[model samples]
Target: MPNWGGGKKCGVCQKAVYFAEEVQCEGSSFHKSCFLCMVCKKNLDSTTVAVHGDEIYCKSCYGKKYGPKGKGKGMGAGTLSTDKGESLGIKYEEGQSHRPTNPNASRMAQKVGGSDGCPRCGQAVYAAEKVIGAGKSWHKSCFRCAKCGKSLESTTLADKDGEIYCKGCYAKNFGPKGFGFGQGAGALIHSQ
Candidate 1:
């Protein structure tokens, strides 16, 4: 309770914490001369004070006692960690993925052709599941090497006759008519 007179009571000296010297804090009042940490006796204001019941402590002292348990993790430059990721991002777990990994969720219905369907399957291709190649959209699943049965990347693919093929297979199938060109003559002479 406040002092019986015209001001609040002092928490330390138990006298009138008058307006000229009162430093009210933690549901109690204290004199400017008497307001200090109980342990270290460091001068404490609202900014640097930590209260536990009637007792008070400075920030550093409070952190040491009840802020975080044990050493190394203590406050005050001891456990200052701001480096989230610096080295080539070798160690990092995604906290939140901003862009959706798979986008085909409750989108427009898949349709045929006209930026709607995969040219390979001639079926509707929704977003995320669609791959752009051959100057048009194709199902990521269908945009594979038509011969080798391996997935064809846009850079390493040959868009021949509206079909996808790897550069290797494309050259093998559409190269010049020479040795090892046509498989019909497996064992043929090198004719010039």
Candidate 2:
């Protein structure tokens, strides 16, 4: 005998191969119980498995290891990047509105002592003077571009990092990703 080591053994347990129930990969044979994910150590199959380099992983483990970097459930999740936000049209601002609101109160109620107030100037938003967008109320003149301070009443408005912008100023600051550019959907901007 040329020291053939008796018989082939399972790569996982270093035991004799049963051949009846064995999983093989990368020239190595593993026992059924040893074919588990490297991260969660959960059972895996062809449909629910992932491979990275020479290591095997489960779908969940693979996602945690190699998926979209920020904004989900991994490292740097809360750190906002300007490039990333612009591409996804995601604006990161404090207290941004998820839905737009329309105020229907009368001018008297607003000017006198109405609870609804202008988000910009912190003054009463008179019905006749209210500018509405981003789910809040603003004075017609108060809704101006954050960069140039130009009035946005006569033109389409854009919001970035919670600051308002006119179409021109918005395009200047953020390029084609500006609101109402190509895509009619809302745009998001981030400012420090």
Candidate 3:
């Protein structure tokens, strides 16, 4: 596959993409992280995201509107599971995703003030921090451990694979010293 160098276009903006920076796409030809779904023309988050087959779906769009995971509006128990590796449907699960209790969810409120001055949690500061790859703004607290919904600041032990967790979570799951997942005083800092 050709690595997209200077010639590229924003998958979302459809504008020219620059070099050095990451150009989102199955191949390196397209630019921009956010792009219309190859299957659905819907805007999708580029961070904490993935691509399956030729379809490009956002987190919510992939899960809620599409995908075979979790219970959807009209989808039912009798409905067939959309877990096909080549399918674009959601997988029907019993409960919701762990995004609610996520620490990142709380951070979203800290950045972007909501209609009532705070959407989910009335945290102090919510400026809506979007990941460089994933453009979706989430609450800080909502950004919890993908394993236990623990705060990433608390559990993130190392910068190895960008694992998320809380302090108690770290000790419990990864032991005292979870290999290279250790975070010191100046651990991980979000620039943008």
Each candidate's root-mean-square deviation in Å? 55.2, 66.5, 79.0
Model 1 over residues 80-151: C-alpha lDDT tens digits? 556565555356555654665755556466656444687776888888777888777788888899888888
- Number of colliding residue pairs in each model: 0, 2, 58
> Which wins on TM-score, candidate 1 or candidate 3?
1
User: Residue 55 in model 2: shift from native, Å?
Assistant: 99
List the lowest-lDDT window of 10 residues for candidate 3.
129-138
Candidate ranking under lDDT, highest first, comes to 1, 2, 3
Looking at model 3, residue 188 earns an lDDT score of: 72
Q: Which numbered prediction scores highest in TM-score against the true structure?
A: 1
Candidate 3 structure quality by residue, lDDT tens digits, 16-65: 76663445656633444444555456545457454665456656655755
Which of the two candidates, 1 or 2, achieves a greater TM-score against the reference? 1
Model 2 local distance difference test score: 0.71
Write the number of the candidate with greater lDDT, choosing between 2 and 3. Answer: 2
Candidate 2 residue-wise lDDT, 1-192, digit = tens: 565344456756778765556777766766667777878878765666666565678887888888877675555445554543334455565665587889786554334555367877788876778877655668887888777888787448876656788888777776655355454677899999
Model 2 regions lying over 4 Å from their true place? 1-115, 176-192
lDDT (C-alpha, whole model) for all candidates: 0.77, 0.71, 0.49
lDDT of 1 at 161: 75
